[PDB]
Amino acid sequence: SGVNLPARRVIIRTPIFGGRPLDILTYKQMVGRAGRKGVDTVGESILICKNSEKSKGIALLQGSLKPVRSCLVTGSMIRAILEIIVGGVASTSQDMHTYAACTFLAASMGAIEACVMWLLENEFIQSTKVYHPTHLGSATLSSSLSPADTLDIFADLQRAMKGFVLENDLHILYLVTPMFEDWTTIDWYRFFCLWEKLPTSMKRVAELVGVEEGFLARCVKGKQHRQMAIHKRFFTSLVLLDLISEVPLREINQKYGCNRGQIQSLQQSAAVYAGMITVFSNRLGWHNMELLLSQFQKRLTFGIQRELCDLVRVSLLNAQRARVLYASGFHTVADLARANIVEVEVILKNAVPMRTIWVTGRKGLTEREAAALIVEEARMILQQDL
Amino acid sequence: SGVNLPARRVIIRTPIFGGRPLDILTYKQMVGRAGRKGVDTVGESILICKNSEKSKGIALLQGSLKPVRSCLVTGSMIRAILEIIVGGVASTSQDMHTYAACTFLAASMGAIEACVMWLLENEFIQSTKVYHPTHLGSATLSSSLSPADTLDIFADLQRAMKGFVLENDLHILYLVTPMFEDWTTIDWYRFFCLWEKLPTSMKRVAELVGVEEGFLARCVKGKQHRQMAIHKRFFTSLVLLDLISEVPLREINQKYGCNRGQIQSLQQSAAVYAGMITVFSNRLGWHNMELLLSQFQKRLTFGIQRELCDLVRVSLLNAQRARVLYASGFHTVADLARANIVEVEVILKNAVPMRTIWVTGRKGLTEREAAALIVEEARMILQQDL
Numbered sequence: 001s002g003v004n005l006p007a008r009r010v011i012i013r014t015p016i017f018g019g020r021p022l023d024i025l026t027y028k029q030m031v032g033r034a035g036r037k038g039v040d041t042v043g044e045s046i047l048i049c050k051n052s053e054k055s056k057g058i059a060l061l062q063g064s065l066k067p068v069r070s071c072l073v074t075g076s077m078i079r080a081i082l083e084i085i086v087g088g089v090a091s092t093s094q095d096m097h098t099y100a101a102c103t104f105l106a107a108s109m110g111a112i113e114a115c116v117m118w119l120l121e122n123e124f125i126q127s128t129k130v131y132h133p134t135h136l137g138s139a140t141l142s143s144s145l146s147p148a149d150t151l152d153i154f155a156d157l158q159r160a161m162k163g164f165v166l167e168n169d170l171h172i173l174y175l176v177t178p179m180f181e182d183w184t185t186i187d188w189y190r191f192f193c194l195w196e197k198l199p200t201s202m203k204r205v206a207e208l209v210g211v212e213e214g215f216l217a218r219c220v221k222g223k224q225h226r227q228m229a230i231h232k233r234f235f236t237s238l239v240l241l242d243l244i245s246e247v248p249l250r251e252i253n254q255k256y257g258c259n260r261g262q263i264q265s266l267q268q269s270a271a272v273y274a275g276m277i278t279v280f281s282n283r284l285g286w287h288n289m290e291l292l293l294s295q296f297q298k299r300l301t302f303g304i305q306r307e308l309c310d311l312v313r314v315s316l317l318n319a320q321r322a323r324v325l326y327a328s329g330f331h332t333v334a335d336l337a338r339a340n341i342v343e344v345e346v347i348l349k350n351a352v353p354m355r356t357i358w359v360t361g362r363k364g365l366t367e368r369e370a371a372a373l374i375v376e377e378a379r380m381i382l383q384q385d386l
Numbered sequence: 387s388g389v390n391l392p393a394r395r396v397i398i399r400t401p402i403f404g405g406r407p408l409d410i411l412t413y414k415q416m417v418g419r420a421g422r423k424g425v426d427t428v429g430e431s432i433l434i435c436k437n438s439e440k441s442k443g444i445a446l447l448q449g450s451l452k453p454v455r456s457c458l459v460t461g462s463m464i465r466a467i468l469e470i471i472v473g474g475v476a477s478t479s480q481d482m483h484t485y486a487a488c489t490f491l492a493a494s495m496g497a498i499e500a501c502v503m504w505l506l507e508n509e510f511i512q513s514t515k516v517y518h519p520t521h522l523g524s525a526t527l528s529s530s531l532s533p534a535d536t537l538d539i540f541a542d543l544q545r546a547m548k549g550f551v552l553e554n555d556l557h558i559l560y561l562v563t564p565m566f567e568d569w570t571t572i573d574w575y576r577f578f579c580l581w582e583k584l585p586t587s588m589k590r591v592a593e594l595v596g597v598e599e600g601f602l603a604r605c606v607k608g609k610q611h612r613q614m615a616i617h618k619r620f621f622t623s624l625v626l627l628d629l630i631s632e633v634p635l636r637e638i639n640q641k642y643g644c645n646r647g648q649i650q651s652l653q654q655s656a657a658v659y660a661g662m663i664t665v666f667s668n669r670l671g672w673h674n675m676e677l678l679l680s681q682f683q684k685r686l687t688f689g690i691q692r693e694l695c696d697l698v699r700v701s702l703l704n705a706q707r708a709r710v711l712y713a714s715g716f717h718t719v720a721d722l723a724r725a726n727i728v729e730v731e732v733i734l735k736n737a738v739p740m741r742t743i744w745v746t747g748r749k750g751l752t753e754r755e756a757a758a759l760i761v762e763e764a765r766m767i768l769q770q771d772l
């Protein structure tokens with residue numbers, strides 16, 4: 001389902017993918033890559049099946065795509081009703097049913113009343129029965145979060161304001177940690193070990209958010225839907241703690257047991273969540289929390305420290321071409337606009353963990369061209385932003 | 387002792403000033419204003435005395451200024467020793483006594499050893515006996531605070547990081563509140579009344595810093611050196627709360643019983659203290675507290691809200707020419723650089739609580755000239771800062 005990568009022959013080892021038969025859409029997506037346009041005369045797809053498996057293989061061969069659905073009480077319809085009401089585009093319930101008469105459900109061929117009742121009973125919307133957005137209802141639509149999740153997000157942030165720990169970045173990370181989902185398979189023993197070795201200030205954040213020690217890779221070590229979601233959020237917030245501490249990905253993998261792809265996926269998800277939480281607090285008139293969260297989206301997107309938050313504005317300074325360029329004295333995009341060209345070439349030549357330097361979207365770049373583009377990007381950034 | 391304000395005749399009602407005889411330096415300062423240069427031929431000072439008072443009056447007439455002193459264990463010598471050691475200008479104790487051989491005490495004609503011992507026993511300085519600044523010793527010299535006060539300041543900030551209240555500005559104000567000193571005569575009943583009417587979130591900050599209700603304008607209402615310094619800091623932090631809430635000075639005076647001169651003096655002192663605390667946290671590697679405190683110095687210097695923190699950068703927008711200029715849509719020094727000249731003239735003409743507008747250092751300014759200078763200052767600010 002990703003990038004366009006055609007191959008002359010596509011061999012699909014087994015029709016059973018992950019314990020379940022291969023999806024017909026997935027199978028079509030795979031076999032559509034068989035054959036390079038303008039190079040090959042034909043393209044070949046070979047699905048390797050056997051014995052009984054032969055039946056599922058022939059079903060995939062002769063199958064066709066399933067019809068499209070709507071997926072619309074439900075979270076999607078709640079989101080849609082909130083989106084229209086809070087935007088001011090629809091006010092009366094007659095308009096509310098008119099809107100549902102414009103959806104895919106109306107084209108495929110009660111719920112809106114239930115959605116309006118749920119939004120009214122949860123203080124997302126006020127009734128005068130003209131429906132008007134509240135402050136929480138406006139903040140949910142602004143920070144782009146599901147109204148189902150926004151209730152617990154509001155409760156968590158409101159509890160965090162009452163007591164906050166400013167001597168580390170872990171409390172500002174537990175709030176921007178999205179969830180556990182399935183980003184990794186948490187090892188309980190490993191978690192408990194890390195916990196037994198946290199600073200004298202972390203466990204303060206751990207107990208201020210809900211984590212424990214009697215249930216913190218303990219009971220589950222030798223073997224509750226919210227406490228599981230807290231510890232699996234604490235561990236997740238510990239990993240991000242090492243991501244914003246510029247710990248190398250291999251060290252994070254060794255200490256936590258999660259591979260680098262999972263760590264990168266988690267950091268991207270956490271940066272998205274941090275941006276959403278920042279907007280949510282900004283629209284709610286929470287100035288003492290939005291100010292704290294305003295930098296963690298960048299610090300999680302690039303996995304950096306605060307010092308590099310100005311250097312990573314350059315498109316070619318991710319988290320290691322900016323740290324080696326920061327240690328040499330360049331700590332600001334201003335010092336990098338006139339940064340001696342050949343100098344940054346030498347600095348990028350040093351510290352190796354022709355076009356060896358790889359840039360996202362630029363593929364491989366030679367050291368000289370890489371740092372030349374770095375200084376040019378710094379010049380553009382500081383020149384067009386004022 | 388203030389500005390140069392000469393008068394033809396200076397009449398000093400009584401030689402007894404504030405229950406004590408008038409200082410000879412103060413008397414000379416008063417009577418030096420008798421006579422305007424280039425206008426009067428002579429100047430007259432008349433000290434009105436009587437009966438016994440006549441003796442103190444004639445003593446003031448025939449008195450002379452006392453000799454200068456040095457005022458240098460003592461807090462001044464501790465400050466001087468810390469200043470030289472942490473600056474790196476002096477390292478060995480031989481150099482430390484050489485420094486004291488350069489002071490006014492050496493010119494007027496043990497202590498340095500006691501000061502070094504006090505700085506060593508309080509972790510301001512490390513001994514290798516070459517003396518080197520620590521992180522706390524470097525942070526004390528950076529944020530310009532007395533090392534005597536910096537210990538309790540460090541303890542208070544360190545306690546605040548563990549538990550902080552971000553849902554109001556009162557916790558960020560209790561840390562930047564200098565002290566009680568004598569800025570006002572606190573009325574206990576009034577204080578207790580205000581306290582009985584605080585938001586459901588203030589008393590959280592009050593109990594997180596040390597304030598109580600059993601002793602909060604209670605016992606002292608019907609009638610301990612630290613609890614007195616906390617409540618007298620809580621009340622002081624409440625007043626500043628109304629100063630940064632843009633409450634009019636007369637309303638603050640009515641609700642708190644402190645006149646406007648005392649309130650302005652307190653707000654200036656608190657802004658100075660906020661700047662010092664911000665630098666102290668900046669040099670200690672406290673990024674989650676320096677970020678919170680980075681705006682309160684301005685918000686206390688001008689007694690404004692956050693929205694006006696960009697408008698008050700203009701020299702002629704204190705806290706009421708910026709609020710009336712903010713309500714009309716100008717919320718940034720960018721919108722005020724091209725702000726229609728005649729438009730801001732009309733806006734300044736409105737909202738009155740020829741040169742009626744008074745500007746600090748510009749004396750009285752006509753509305754047209756005032757807002758013309760306002761837009762010119764905005765242009766200069768946004769033009770020379772990038």
Ligand SMILES: COc1ccccc1-c1ccncc1C(=O)Nc1nnc(OCc2ccc(Cl)cc2)s1
Nearest residue numbers: 142143144145271272273274275276277279280297
């Ligand atoms: C909550 O918003 C986020 C902020 C940071 C990072 C991720 C998200 C996010 C996360 C999950 N799902 C969605 C979003 C999302 O992008 N929502 C957005 N809403 N507005 C945006 O700006 C676009 C824009 C701005 C101004 C104008 Cl005039 C027109 C368009 S982005």
Ligand SMILES: COc1ccccc1-c1ccncc1C(=O)Nc1nnc(OCc2ccc(Cl)cc2)s1
Nearest residue numbers: 528529530531657658659660661662663665666683
């Ligand atoms: C703690 O510093 C404060 C900061 C804000 C407001 C009040 C104070 C304060 C309060 C009580 N006593 C003293 C101060 C004071 O100004 N100390 C200062 N130290 N350095 C400064 O900047 C001058 C400077 C800067 C850079 C160079 Cl290269 C040369 C000189 S000011």
